């Protein structure tokens, strides 16, 4: 279809950068073979990670082979780090961070706050306003400092468009406080809004206005997360359209929690390809994460998974693997170096000299 051909053109346009450098065998100047193999993608192809990574080595091996970015499914939410008032625990999250660090997988932080009441610790919901804020104060300072420099990103206040637990008690100025004070504690962290029904539904204009209001209020929102929880069908054209609207704020966009549900793995694969190809082709998008992969541990069950219960791929996992292969630069050339190559890091051989080629510049 037309949407795929335009997507592929923008992929070549925005995801690659022509290569050429060094090449001297002690001052030689015109032949030899040159091997150009990509070893890391700059673009994020990540996944939610859950408790299975602590006891399921098959799950752990599968993760490392398929995802270059992670986010924790539950183990950094407030109720999980403070299940009872004043009883603070980060052990599970720290263990998952060590696993990710030893495999050099960057981790998104999810999430310091969540505006939806039903997602907050139950002990918080009977407290008077000023005690709620005191608990908020300690959460932000205790978790913000504990995770300082561990997360590349924070979902600072999840789903502000679809809750009102904190806004009702303190007004939208509490949101400026959330972003401002996280920025001060952890300047290196890229601070996100993250919300649903924006590309899977038509709330993108509301979201755009919502990002605007947060920034005019002074909140240092640096990036836009769109969750990408779809139902049964992914229309690539409308997704591209809704992304177009959000791109006008000049902020990087990440698809943070992709999944769709369909009994027929074939359509599941088509949905996945539709979102990933369109997302990978949008110049404002910088990464995609899948909210789980394995039928044994997916929050929407086996009809959303790319790998079956017994760890055999289904068609959606196969399609995911082929998309990764399609989007990997592996070239042998004789030629004095010329090829387009996806952003990332490269081993160039004459496996000898590892070299980076990022996206800061657009000219070779």
Binding site for Ca ion (CB under 5 A): 74-75, 80, 92, 196, 198-200, 226-228
> Minimum CB separation from Ca ion for residue 33, in Å?
46
Q: How far is the CB of 55 from Ca ion (least distance, A)?
A: 13
Look up residue 68 and give its DSSP letter. Answer: S
Select 242 or 319, whichever has its Cβ closest to Ca ion: 242
Q: Closest approach of Cβ 273 to Ca ion, in Å?
A: 17
Say if residues 226 and 199 touch (Cβ distance below 8 Å): yes
Shortest CB 344 distance to Ca ion, Å: 27
Q: E-assigned strands of 259-326?
A: 285-290
> CA-CA distance, 253 to 234, in Å (whole number)?
18
Q: DSSP for 131-200?
A: HHHHHHHHHHHHHHHHTTTT-SEEEEEETGGG--TTHHHH-THHHHHHHHHHHHH-TTSEEEEEESSSSS
DSSP 75-101: TTSHHHH-SBTTB---HHHHHHHHHHH
CA angle 265–269–271, rounded 5-degree value: 115
67 or 90: CB nearest Ca ion: 90
What is the rounded CA–CA span in Å between residue 332 and residue 348?
10
d(CA 329, CA 344): 9
| 259, 293 contact by CB (below 8 A) | no
Q: For Ca ion, give the closer residue by CB, 227 or 314.
A: 227
**Residue 264 CB partners (closer than 8 Å, separation 6+):** none
**Annotated catalytic residue, options 73, 75, 203, 257:** 257
Smallest gap from Cβ 302 to Ca ion, in A, equals 22
Q: Of the residues 159, 203, 222, 273, which is catalytic?
A: 159
Peptide bond into 111 cis (omega under 30): yes
Residue number, 201 or 311, with CB nearest to Ca ion: 201
Place of tokens 């100047």: 29
- Minimum distance from residue 328 beta carbon to Ca ion (Å): 27
**E-assigned strands of the chain?**
34-41, 44-49, 70-72, 107-114, 153-158, 190-195, 223-226, 253-258, 285-290, 330-333, 344-349, 353-357
Among residues 186 and 257, whose Cβ is nearest to Ca ion?
257
Query: Closest by alpha carbon to 274, among 325, 319, 226, 317?
Result: 319
The verdict on whether 75 is a catalytic residue reads no
- When the beta carbons of 96 and 140 are compared against Ca ion, the nearer one is 96
Min separation Cβ 236 and Ca ion, Å: 14
Task: Report how far residue 59's alpha carbon sits from residue 51's, in angstroms, rounded to the nearest whole number.
Answer: 10
For Ca ion, give the closer residue by CB, 92 or 282: 92
Among residues 190, 303, 205, 202, the alpha carbon closest in space to that of 252 is found at 190
Write out the catalytic residue numbers. 159, 257
């Amino acid at each position: 279809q037309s949407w795929r051909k335009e997507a592929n053109d923008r992929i070549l346009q925005h995801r690659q950068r022509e290569l050429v450098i060094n090449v001297i065998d002690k001052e030689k100047k015109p032949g030899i073979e040159v091997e150009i193999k990509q070893i890391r993608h700059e673009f994020a192809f990540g996944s939610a990670m859950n408790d299975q990574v602590l006891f399921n080595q098959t799950y752990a091996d599968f993760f490392v082979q398929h995802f270059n970015w992670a986010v924790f499914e539950n183990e950094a939410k407030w109720y999980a780090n403070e299940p009872e008032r004043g009883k603070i625990t980060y052990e599970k999250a720290d263990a998952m961070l060590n696993f990710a660090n030893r495999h050099q997988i960057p981790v998104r932080g999810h999430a310091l706050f969540w505006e939806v009441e039903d997602a907050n610790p139950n002990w918080l919901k009977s407290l008077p306003n000023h005690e709620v804020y005191e608990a908020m104060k300690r959460r932000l300072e205790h978790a913000g400092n504990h995770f300082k420099g561990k997360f590349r990103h924070w979902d600072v206040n999840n789903e502000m468009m679809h809750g009102s637990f904190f806004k009702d008690r303190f007004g939208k100025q509490i949101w400026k406080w959330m972003y401002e004070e996280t920025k001060k504690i952890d300047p290196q962290a890229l601070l996100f809004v993250n919300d649903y029904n924006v590309i899977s539904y038509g709330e993108h204009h509301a979201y755009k206005a919502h990002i605007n209001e947060l920034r005019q209020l002074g909140a240092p929102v640096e990036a836009i997360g769109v969750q990408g929880h779809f139902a049964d069908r992914v229309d690539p054209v409308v997704v591209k359209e809704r992304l177009d609207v959000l791109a006008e704020l000049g902020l990087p966009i990440w698809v943070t929690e992709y999944d769709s549900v369909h009994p027929d793995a074939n359509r599941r694969a088509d949905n996945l390809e539709a979102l990933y190809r369109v997302a990978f082709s949008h110049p404002a998008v910088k990464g995609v994460l899948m909210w789980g992969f394995w039928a044994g541990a997916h929050w929407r069950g086996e009809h959303a998974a790319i790998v079956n219960h017994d760890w055999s791929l289904n068609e959606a996992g196969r399609r995911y693997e082929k998309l990764l292969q399609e989007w990997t630069t592996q070239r042998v050339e004789k030629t004095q170096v010329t090829c387009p190559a996806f952003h990332g890091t490269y081993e160039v051989r004459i496996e000898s000299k590892m070299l980076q080629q990022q996206t800061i510049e657009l000219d070779s």
